[PDB]
Design a binder for this molecule. Structure first.
Ligand SMILES: N#C[C@H](c1ccnc(NCCc2cccnc2)n1)c1nc2ccccc2s1
Lengths: 271, 8
């Protein structure tokens, strides 16, 4: 049973995503996170290669190998909830709190972080998973290894090439075609959220709060940002989805060159 | 200026 395999520690967070606790796997003292989701709150259901929440399906699809995505270790069904056991980086801070405390990040640091988010999102898409809630709050930084982890697949979907008409991610990271038409395509919408993230990193906060700003097409820079970085941001936040870069184009952008290794990032910017 | 979290 769940209760004789994991020792439960403090609550790490709770909200729309459910309740997440720190834990330790009793057998080898491995650090884990234990996420609880109420059944009445699970909207999207899948079937496993058993009927489980879509989140479990998506996590299993991305859990193979080493990546910048959080790894599902196990899961349990209860009468009124599902419990997910995830790996837990330590020591860790989420990217939201990191930017709050440090302010606008040096571009070298934003380049390393953003590069790693790109690789993690490429991994997801390669595995047929669309995250749908890319934001600083959903990124953990392993402060010792300089490695980033994408968390909270609870808003995600199977990746398809047709239009999505549903969305329960974060509105301020959502693209103008969603705001205006309640329709988006997966990859192009992901690139928009990525531009919002990169702005957030180099400026200290997201560019837009209001629907009218999102749809407006104007990126005001509140911090000194290099012309190459401003250009990438603005390309990612092109109002027309087809004007947005592919993942390849992002990673081939001049601003993205000479990225730091994770360990160099940790040594220079985190230790 | 006020920075805030945003629920999903
Ligand atoms: N879903 C989900 C979440 C989640 C969603 C939204 N906000 C949070 N905030 C908690 C962030 C955090 C994580 C680790 C330590 N301290 C704080 N967490 C998390 N999943 C994991 C998985 C492994 C380790 C931590 C988390 S938090």
């Amino acid at each position: 049973p769940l209760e004789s395999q994991y020792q439960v520690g403090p609550l790490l967070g709770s909200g729309g995503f459910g309740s997440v606790y720190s834990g330790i796997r009793v057998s080898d003292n491995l650090p884990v996170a234990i996420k609880h989701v109420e059944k009445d709150r699970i909207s999207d259901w899948g079937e496993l290669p058993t009927r489980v929440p879509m989140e479990v399906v998506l996590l299993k699809k991305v859990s193979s190998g080493f990546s910048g995505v959080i790894r599902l270790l196990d899961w349990f069904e209860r009468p009124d909830s599902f419990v997910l056991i995830l790996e837990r980086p330590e020591p860790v801070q989420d990217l939201f709190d990191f930017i709050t405390e440090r302010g606008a990040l040096q571009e070298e640091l934003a380049r390393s972080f953003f590069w790693q988010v790109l690789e993690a999102v490429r991994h997801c898409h390669n595995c047929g998973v669309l995250h749908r809630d890319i934001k600083d709050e959903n990124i953990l930084i392993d402060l010792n290894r300089g490695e980033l982890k994408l968390i909270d697949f609870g808003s995600g979907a199977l990746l398809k090439d047709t239009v999505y008409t549903d969305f329960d991610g974060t509105r301020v990271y959502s693209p103008p075609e969603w705001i205006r038409y309640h329709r988006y395509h997966g990859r192009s919408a992901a690139v928009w959220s990525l531009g919002i993230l990169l702005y957030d990193m180099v400026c200290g906060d997201i560019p837009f709060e209001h629907d009218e700003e999102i749809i407006g097409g104007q990126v005001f820079f509140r911090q000194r940002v290099s012309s190459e970085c401003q250009h990438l941001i603005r390309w990612c936040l092109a109002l027309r989805p087809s004007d947005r870069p592919t993942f390849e184009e992002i990673q081939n952008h001049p601003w993205m060159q000479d990225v730091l290794l994770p360990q160099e990032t940790a040594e220079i910017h985190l230790h | 200026r006020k920075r805030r979290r945003h629920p999903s």
